[PDB]
């Protein structure tokens, strides 16, 4: 846990001479802090 | 006479009845079905009587 994911199909390795070139992407990890809660009344009707 | 004798003793005690029960209840999920319940049983009684 911790990083969130990461896109394995995105990693790329590039060797040319002794240049060791990577590239690739990872989404960071986060710990929550603000919780938006939309909450909606509504009527329901009841039939016998 | 004697109908509407019964048309008005029956209209009170339905009146008077449904207003103590279910007034001031709650508007639970099984609210309809324990009307349905409680108005058969005041009809079968009646019908008894």
Do not use: C, H, W
């Not at chain 1, 995105?10 to 909450?39: H, W």
């Not at chain 2, 008005?8 to 449904?18: A, G, H, M, N, R």
């Not at chain 2, 319940?37 to 009587?49: A, M, P, T, V, W």
Request: hydrophobic share 40%; glycine share 4%.
């Amino acid at each position: 846990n911790e990083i969130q994911d990461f896109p394995a199909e995105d990693v790329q390795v590039i060797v040319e001479g002794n240049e060791a070139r990577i590239s690739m992407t990872v989404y960071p990890i986060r710990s929550f802090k603000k919780i938006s809660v939309s909450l909606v009344y509504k009527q329901q009707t009841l039939q016998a | 006479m004697a109908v509407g004798e019964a048309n008005d003793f029956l209209v009170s005690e339905l009146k008077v009845q449904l207003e103590d029960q279910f007034i001031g209840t709650r508007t639970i999920n099984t609210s309809a079905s324990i009307i349905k319940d409680f108005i058969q049983s005041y009809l079968g009684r009646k019908k008894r009587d």
